[PDB]
Design a protein around this nucleic acid. Structure first.
Ligand SMILES: [Zn+2]
Lengths: 101, 221, 25, 217, 71, 129, 132, 83
RNA sequence: AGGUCUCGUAGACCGUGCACCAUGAGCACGAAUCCU
RNA sequence: CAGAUACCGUCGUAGUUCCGACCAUAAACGAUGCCGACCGGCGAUGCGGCGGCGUUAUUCCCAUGACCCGCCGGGCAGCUUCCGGGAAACCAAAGUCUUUGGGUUCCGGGGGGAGUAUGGUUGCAAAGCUGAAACUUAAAGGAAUUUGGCGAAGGGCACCACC
């Protein structure tokens, strides 16, 4: 039978949306269906940041970040442990998971 | 074989100040002790079973069967009930089904066909009761017709005391439990249908709990 | 068997039948 | 309920309503309680009427005094903000108190030791105590509620428009309800100030208990 | 019934005729193929001539061989 | 588009009765509805009813009493006679003790009993019990 | 893994409900008490009862526990909920009143009360939190 | 319930709701006959006159019974008419 | 003139895939009510 | 890989692009036809209009663009519900239904044979539309509970498992 109120997407009064390409594989996926993520990453982690900070021309120099936006289909997101399955009752929750740290 | 009631209603019936349970249906109180109806309805109340069906559940090892028995209870000049209970052994299943039937009996009213002479014989109106997929219709019949039905709602209708019904059914009536439940729902809703015979405002008698709460507080703590 | 490939094989047999019917009028 | 020229508020009940902060309601509203609210003011707070609260106080007091057995009124609070108010109300009226952890088998399970079947039921809120209303639906039990402008009205009979977030307004309304019931019973006179203090009903957190113990004797 | 009009009968009779053609027993009762594929041709009994004897077997759940003839 | 007026009028009455409303607001005010509620009012099922008059099809406000089960409309305007009225009474009514068949005729608009007594037939309008 | 069961904990709760005065922090003293006030089939489970009632003595000396109700620690609750001070905290000499509240009191039963003062309302009616 | 003779064939007459005017059945457990007290006209204490009001389970489950009790009290003369 | 600003320190969300993995002959199972 | 004309990798012909001439098929799916009326709300959103404290285009005024609080009508939709419907999943429509009748159009009678052969028709072609029968079978299906088994995921345990 029908699993969800929508169909794993957000297309309601459109009928057609443009497709995009996935990032892990090259599978063609519609834009509104793909599990997208936008991570704010760093150039260096918390190990080399002291090495850059002590051995720099300028003191207290702010390091640039890495803004990349990833687009995943269902199989690539599940197989790379991005989204996980839930219960039937626990599926009805559009809130993101909490960020304690 | 003494009676030790735990509710207010059972003790107050045991004190021999309830003349009939018609006022208990009038106040729509839950009949919670099964031996109150056994105290009221005695030799006029007899029973017969309907069907015992197999119900099985799988486990790691083998099949766990459990017997579910359908029985009905009711005097032939009024009230009628139905009860379902499922257990391992057959005798305790039948005993629990008879008990759960005696918890839930309802009174029915009987009407006329054309002329109002003597005692009534048939259902007053086309009263309909539906549960699951089964749809049961009870249409009044002229005097001396007899119950025309499938055999088990026919026996339920004579055990309810109604002499004449014109009946009809649709859907899968082979499930005898759901069919009997639909017949019980049809004969239960013969009270909740407003007719012009009763439109005046009923006088409000005092509550039996309100009438004998002094007796209750002088008997128990 | 899904319906697509059995529709395809009926299509090829229909084509072969039409060719043989045209060559055997 | 307010039809006589004796049973109204004289001068001081409105003063205690304004002192306890009973006049302000929640941000949200109920369409069942749109006639119990005066209007809406700025900052999204509803100003609540006091005559309507008085008329439900009369009606709740009448329904309580109407029966002649004081042990068949049951008063229930699950939140900590009114546990002592229920206890003092049952001490002053003879009622049956339930404070905290209402077990789900009191009104319907006949084999338990705590099998109760009262005649009237008063509860502090329909929001948090959505459990005793459904169990009091299965047996013919009425329901009296000290309900807020945001709390839903389901399975209730008298809905007193109240302020059930602060301890102050709730303790004052249990005190005035006990006062009015004891006036209808006749043990307490209708005109003499019988006030022991209304501070016998007021609840506070244990940090303020320690603070007041160290500040006072 | 869907169409409810005081003077709508032609549509109802046409729909009833088409939907009555869309049946199985009425197809078997109102076609020449059903009355011509009948080996007896609308007869309860028929005579015959025995040619030889054929022994056919039963189905898979119950195993036996039955005795038949060609007539 | 609004085609028949008695059908959705009694449908609104049936909806407001089984919900539990006290008053209902019928948006048109045609004479057939007025005659039907005068028949139903003289039978003593529904209470007083107002009517609002303006320069269009005005509104109708009915004070409803707890004496009504269902108001139904038989559509289209079927033909009925005196010799075949008992079949309609048998298959359309829950009992032979009450319930009326309102029908239009040359003698006006009334129930089936007055039409039987005055010996006339006509077209069907609806039913209520 | 030293985890106690319901038998030793329930029996300990019962004897600390019934016998609270003749106890103490000494393990051997309440071991002899558990020998006296209760019959025991064993000795290992006796030592478990004595150790756990010593633990319950350390828990009672720190604070209340919601499993038992000892009468010596009881009725100081009623002492804390039974005192009456000199001010009820609602007989104040001044009460702050809103202009909408002032208008609602104007139609209520009176025209002016001599224990109230009117406050200026806020200048901007922004009250809802930013959610989206 | 009557006939040509005069006896009532229905064994009892069930109560009707004071708000929606529906038949209270045997198994409508949410039906409540709420009993309120009437006060004296001078002294203002309990006298003994009783005003029994009734309600059905459907409007109680929908949650609009308090307005019905208030309107019944206003019609009876319990709640003051200014309100 | 004083010369370590205050309060506790999840201070680990470094990664994206992972070798090849087919098949199982049937015979072998039955559904119930209460005292003398 | 046992076999690989397959998953994988490097090239790669038609194609993918535009003009001009054609076929008219999709899980063309909200798997839910169109018009109209009625029956619980709540919080946001897009358009246009209405009203009202305060802030801004720097301090006075006017209406404007940008905020705040509310309404009205249309539209895409969201959350709860013993109104109600259903076999259930679910549905504010899939409700107003044995208490069956608002108006109108198309479409289906067990499962295969089968969208198959033939007849007709359009098209350069591929094909599109209309559309059977003989025969065979007692099942084929829909919803959901309970153990089962996963080269599914999460907590763990075990020297008859590993390190
Ligand atoms: Zn991919």
């Amino acid at each position: 039978t029908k699993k969800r109120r929508n169909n794993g997407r957000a297309k309601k009064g459109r009928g057609h949306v443009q497709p995009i390409r996935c990032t892990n594989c090259a599978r063609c996926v519609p834009k509104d269906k793909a599990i997208k993520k936008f991570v704010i990453r760093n150039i260096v982690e918390a190990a080399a940041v002291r090495d850059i900070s002590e051995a720099s021309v300028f003191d207290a120099y702010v390091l640039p970040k890495l803004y990349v936006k990833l687009h995943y289909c269902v199989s690539c997101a599940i197989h790379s442990k991005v989204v996980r399955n839930r219960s039937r009752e626990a599926r009805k929750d559009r809130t993101p998971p909490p960020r304690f740290r | 074989k003494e009676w030790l009631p735990v509710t207010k209603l059972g003790r107050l019936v045991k004190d021999m100040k309830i003349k009939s349970l018609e006022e208990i249906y009038l106040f729509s109180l839950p009949i919670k002790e099964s031996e109150i109806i056994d105290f009221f309805l005695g030799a006029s109340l007899k029973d017969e079973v309907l069907k015992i069906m197999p119900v099985q559940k799988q486990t790691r090892a083998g099949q766990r069967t459990r017997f579910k028995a359908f029985v009905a209870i009711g005097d032939y000049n009024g009230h009628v009930g139905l009860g379902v209970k499922c257990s391992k052994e057959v005798a305790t299943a039948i005993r629990g089904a008879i008990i759960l039937a005696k918890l839930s009996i309802v009174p029915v009213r009987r009407g006329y066909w054309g002329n109002k002479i003597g005692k009534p014989h048939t259902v007053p109106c086309k009263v309909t009761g539906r549960c699951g997929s089964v749809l049961v219709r009870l249409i009044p019949a002229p005097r001396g017709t007899g119950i025309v039905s499938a055999p088990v709602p026919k026996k339920l209708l004579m055990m309810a005391g109604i002499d004449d019904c014109y009946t009809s059914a649709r859907g899968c009536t082979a499930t005898l439990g759901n069919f009997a439940k639909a017949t019980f729902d049809a004969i239960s809703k013969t009270y909740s249908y407003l007719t012009p015979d009763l439109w005046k405002e009923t006088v409000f008698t005092k509550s039996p709990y309100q009438e004998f709460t002094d007796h209750l507080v002088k008997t128990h703590t | 068997m899904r319906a697509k490939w059995r529709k395809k094989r009926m299509r090829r047999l229909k084509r072969k039948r039409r060719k043989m019917r045209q060559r055997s009028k | 309920s307010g039809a006589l020229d004796v049973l109204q508020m004289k001068e001081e009940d409105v003063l205690k309503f304004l002192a306890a902060g009973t006049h302000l309601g929640g941000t949200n509203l109920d369409f069942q309680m749109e006639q119990y609210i005066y209007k809406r003011k700025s900052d999204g707070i509803y100003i609540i009427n006091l005559k309507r609260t008085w008329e439900k106080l009369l009606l709740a007091a009448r329904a309580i005094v109407a029966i002649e057995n004081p042990a068949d009124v049951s008063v229930i609070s699950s939140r900590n903000t009114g546990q002592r108010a229920v206890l003092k109300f049952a001490a002053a009226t003879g009622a049956t108190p339930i404070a905290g952890r209402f077990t789900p088998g009191t009104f319907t399970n006949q084999i338990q030791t705590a099998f109760r079947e009262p005649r009237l039921l008063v509860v502090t809120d329909p929001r948090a105590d959505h459990q005793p209303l459904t169990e009091a639906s299965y047996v013919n039990l009425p329901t009296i509620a000290l309900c807020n402008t945001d709390s839903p009205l389901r399975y209730v009979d008298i809905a007193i428009p109240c302020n059930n977030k602060g301890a102050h307004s709730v303790g004052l309304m249990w005190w005035m309800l006990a006062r009015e019931v004891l006036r209808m019973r006749g043990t307490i006179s209708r005109e003499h100030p019988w006030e022991v203090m209304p501070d016998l009903y007021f609840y506070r957190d244990p940090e303020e208990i320690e603070k007041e113990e160290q500040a006072a004797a | 019934g869907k169409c409810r009009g005081l003077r709508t009968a032609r549509k109802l009779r046409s729909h009833r005729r088409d939907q009555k053609w869309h049946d199985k027993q009425y197809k078997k009762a109102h076609l020449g193929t059903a009355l011509k594929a009948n080996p007896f041709g609308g007869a309860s009994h028929a005579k015959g001539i025995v040619l030889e004897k054929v022994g056919v077997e039963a189905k898979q759940p119950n195993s036996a061989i039955r005795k038949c003839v060609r007539v | 588009v609004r085609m028949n007026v008695l059908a959705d009028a009694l449908k609104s009455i049936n909806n407001a009765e089984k919900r539990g409303k006290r008053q209902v607001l019928i948006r048109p005010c045609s004479k057939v509805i007025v005659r039907f509620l005068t028949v139903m009012m003289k039978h003593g099922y529904i209470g007083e009813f107002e009517i609002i008059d303006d320069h269009r099809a005005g509104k109708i406000v009915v004070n409803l009493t707890g004496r009504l089960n269902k108001c139904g409309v038989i559509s289209p305007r079927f033909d009925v006679q005196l010799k075949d009225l008992e079949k309609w009474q048998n298959n359309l009514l829950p009992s032979r003790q009450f319930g009326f068949i309102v029908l239009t005729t040359s003698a006006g608009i009334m129930d089936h009993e007055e039409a039987r007594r005055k010996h006339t037939g006509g077209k069907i309008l609806g039913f209520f019990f | 893994g030293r985890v106690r069961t319901k038998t030793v904990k329930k029996a300990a709760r019962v004897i600390i409900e019934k016998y609270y005065t003749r106890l103490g922090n000494d393990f051997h003293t309440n071991k002899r008490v558990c020998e006296e006030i209760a019959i025991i089939p064993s000795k290992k489970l006796r030592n478990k009862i004595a150790g756990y009632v010593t633990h319950l003595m350390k828990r009672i000396q720190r604070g209340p526990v919601r499993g038992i109700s000892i009468k010596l620690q009881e009725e100081e609750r009623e002492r804390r909920d039974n005192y009456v001070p000199e001010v009820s905290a609602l007989d104040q000499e001044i009460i702050e009143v809103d202009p909408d509240t002032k208008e609602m009191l104007k139609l209520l039963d009176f025209g002016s009360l001599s224990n109230l003062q009117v406050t200026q309302p806020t200048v901007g009616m922004n009250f809802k939190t930013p959610r989206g | 319930m009557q006939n040509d003779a005069g006896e009532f064939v229905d064994l009892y007459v069930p109560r009707k709701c004071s708000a929606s005017n529906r038949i209270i059945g045997a198994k409508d457990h949410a039906s409540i006959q709420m009993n309120v007290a009437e006060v004296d006209k001078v002294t203002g204490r309990f006298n003994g006159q009783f005003k029994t009001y009734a309600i059905c389970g459907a409007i109680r489950r929908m949650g609009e019974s308090d307005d019905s009790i208030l309107r019944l009290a206003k019609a009876d003369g319990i709640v003051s008419k200014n309100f």
